[PDB]
Design an enzyme around this catalytic site. Structure first.
Site, mmCIF file in Angstrom:
data_model
loop_
_atom_site.group_PDB
_atom_site.id
_atom_site.type_symbol
_atom_site.label_atom_id
_atom_site.label_comp_id
_atom_site.label_asym_id
_atom_site.label_seq_id
_atom_site.Cartn_x
_atom_site.Cartn_y
_atom_site.Cartn_z
ATOM 1 N N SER A 82 0.843 -1.186 0.000
ATOM 2 C CA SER A 82 0.000 0.000 0.000
ATOM 3 C C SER A 82 0.881 1.240 0.000
ATOM 4 C CB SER A 82 -0.897 0.012 1.237
ATOM 5 O OG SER A 82 -0.122 0.112 2.420
ATOM 6 N N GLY A 117 3.391 4.372 -1.503
ATOM 7 C CA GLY A 117 4.749 4.295 -1.999
ATOM 8 C C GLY A 117 4.815 4.389 -3.509
ATOM 9 N N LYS A 175 9.609 -7.766 -8.403
ATOM 10 C CA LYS A 175 9.979 -6.394 -8.065
ATOM 11 C C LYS A 175 10.694 -5.649 -9.185
ATOM 12 C CE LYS A 175 12.542 -3.670 -4.647
ATOM 13 N NZ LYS A 175 13.241 -3.674 -3.319
ATOM 14 N N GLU A 232 11.205 -14.875 -3.698
ATOM 15 C CA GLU A 232 10.355 -15.862 -3.048
ATOM 16 C C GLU A 232 9.181 -15.084 -2.466
ATOM 17 O OE1 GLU A 232 13.532 -19.075 -1.097
ATOM 18 O OE2 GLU A 232 12.875 -17.306 0.035
ATOM 19 N N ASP A 240 18.514 -0.877 6.402
ATOM 20 C CA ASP A 240 17.134 -0.400 6.462
ATOM 21 C C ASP A 240 16.244 -1.371 7.234
ATOM 22 O OD1 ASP A 240 15.126 1.484 6.029
ATOM 23 O OD2 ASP A 240 14.573 0.679 4.057
HETATM 24 N N1 LIG Z 1 9.100 -11.277 -1.426
HETATM 25 C C1 LIG Z 1 7.910 -10.615 -1.202
HETATM 26 N N2 LIG Z 1 6.782 -11.302 -0.904
HETATM 27 C C2 LIG Z 1 5.614 -10.678 -0.684
HETATM 28 N N3 LIG Z 1 5.511 -9.347 -0.755
HETATM 29 C C3 LIG Z 1 6.587 -8.582 -1.048
HETATM 30 C C4 LIG Z 1 7.846 -9.199 -1.282
HETATM 31 N N4 LIG Z 1 8.735 -8.217 -1.544
HETATM 32 C C5 LIG Z 1 8.133 -7.073 -1.499
HETATM 33 N N5 LIG Z 1 6.800 -7.237 -1.202
HETATM 34 C C6 LIG Z 1 5.778 -6.171 -1.083
HETATM 35 O O1 LIG Z 1 6.225 -4.983 -1.781
HETATM 36 C C7 LIG Z 1 6.381 -3.894 -0.819
HETATM 37 C C8 LIG Z 1 7.670 -3.116 -1.029
HETATM 38 O O2 LIG Z 1 8.730 -4.059 -1.162
HETATM 39 P P1 LIG Z 1 10.104 -3.263 -1.382
HETATM 40 O O3 LIG Z 1 11.221 -4.220 -1.479
HETATM 41 O O4 LIG Z 1 10.294 -2.292 -0.149
HETATM 42 O O5 LIG Z 1 9.909 -2.441 -2.787
HETATM 43 P P2 LIG Z 1 10.242 -0.850 -2.811
HETATM 44 O O6 LIG Z 1 10.721 -0.591 -4.190
HETATM 45 O O7 LIG Z 1 11.408 -0.380 -1.847
HETATM 46 N N6 LIG Z 1 8.780 0.013 -2.699
HETATM 47 P P3 LIG Z 1 8.685 1.052 -1.336
HETATM 48 O O8 LIG Z 1 9.384 0.523 -0.161
HETATM 49 O O9 LIG Z 1 7.137 1.214 -0.962
HETATM 50 O O10 LIG Z 1 9.298 2.478 -1.740
HETATM 51 C C9 LIG Z 1 6.340 -4.486 0.607
HETATM 52 O O11 LIG Z 1 5.642 -3.521 1.393
HETATM 53 C C10 LIG Z 1 5.557 -5.777 0.394
HETATM 54 O O12 LIG Z 1 4.188 -5.648 0.775
#
Ligand SMILES: Nc1ncnc2c1ncn2[C@@H]1O[C@H](COP(=O)(O)OP(=O)(O)NP(=O)(O)O)[C@@H](O)[C@H]1O
Ligand SMILES: [Mg+2]
Length: 273
Positions: A14, A16, A35, A89, A135
């Site tokens: 949610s 971001g 991702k 994963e 982090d």
């Molecule tokens: N391996 C995973 N399994 C399930 N959900 C995941 C996984 N990796 C990431 N997510 C979801 O994606 C979101 C952000 O993952 P993240 O690695 O922090 O991407 P980000 O690019 O840094 N986006 P943000 O942190 O919001 O600026 C998390 O809040 C999770 O809800």
């Protein structure tokens, strides 16, 4: 390609500006997270064993994704003209620790102990692999609800672990140490321990202890929820103002409050079921 190897589902999370999709590997129907990382948003680049130019996040994930661990593993990655795509994963069912605390409030100490212990083991694994996460926070911890296992995610702010000073930082400010806030410098391990202190307080009190820079540098910890003296002692030790006064990972795990931890499965049966 990519769209053929994986069935892409809806966006996860949610708010971001990130882009992580739920997915399924067609070959074996394995649940995965897809991702996407924007190249123009990448500030730290690295090179894999072969020597290819990739985001540091990929370099670090590869270093920690060997064997089993409390870290979400990188299964594969792809490079596109303007981005990189990481296949990770994906536990199912799952919920991140931030959302878990939002719904449950301050956690019972037995549960906080189990969770914190698992985070410590995961961070130790990272350091053993020569990786500094930078982090650590509830938003970057996923809970495998059925197994009671925690998984560390997002190495997008990480770096290779080194013994010399760090003068760059792009992690979460409210989890950053006073030496960074005041002097823009820190050492890896002691900065990690500070963030762990913030995380532990977050678990047992339901919210982080500091919101402003002045609070971080003052280092005075006020407990807003009933927390045992042993737990308070551990938190205050992790949040020592002087880096050298903070505990090592060994001292944290040998602390009286950390003894008799529940096993992951027991944790799920008692607190997640
Ligand atoms: N391996 C995973 N399994 C399930 N959900 C995941 C996984 N990796 C990431 N997510 C979801 O994606 C979101 C952000 O993952 P993240 O690695 O922090 O991407 P980000 O690019 O840094 N986006 P943000 O942190 O919001 O600026 C998390 O809040 C999770 O809800
Ligand atoms: Mg993130």
């Amino acid at each position: 390609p990519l769209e053929s190897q994986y069935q892409v589902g809806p966006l996860l999370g949610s708010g971001g500006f990130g882009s992580v999709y739920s997915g399924i590997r067609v070959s074996d129907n394995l649940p995965v997270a897809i991702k996407h990382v924007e190249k123009d948003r990448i500030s730290d680049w690295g090179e894999l064993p072969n020597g290819t130019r990739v985001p540091m996040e990929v370099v670090l994930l590869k270093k920690v994704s060997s064997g089993f661990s409390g870290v979400i593993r990188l299964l594969d990655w792809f490079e596109r003209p303007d981005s990189f795509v990481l296949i990770l994963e994906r536990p199912e069912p799952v919920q991140d620790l931030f959302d878990f605390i939002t719904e449950r409030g301050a956690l019972q100490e037995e549960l906080a102990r189990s969770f914190f212990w698992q985070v410590l083991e995961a961070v130790r694994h990272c350091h053993n692999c020569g990786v500094l996460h930078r982090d650590i926070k509830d938003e970057n911890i996923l809970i495998d609800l059925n197994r009671g296992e925690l998984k560390l995610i997002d190495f997008g702010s990480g770096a290779l672990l080194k013994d010399t000073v760090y003068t760059d930082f792009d992690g979460t400010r409210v989890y950053s140490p006073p030496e960074w806030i005041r002097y823009h410098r820190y050492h890896g391990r002691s900065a990690a321990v500070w963030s762990l202190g913030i995380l532990l307080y977050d678990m047992v009190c339901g919210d982080i202890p500091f919101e402003h820079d002045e609070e971080i540098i003052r280092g005075q910890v006020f407990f807003r929820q009933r927390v045992s003296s042993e737990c308070q002692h551990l938190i205050r030790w992790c949040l020592a103002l002087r880096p050298s006064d903070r505990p090592t990972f060994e001292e944290i795990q040998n602390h009286p409050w950390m003894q008799d931890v529940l096993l992951p499965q027991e944790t799920a049966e008692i607190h997640l079921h």
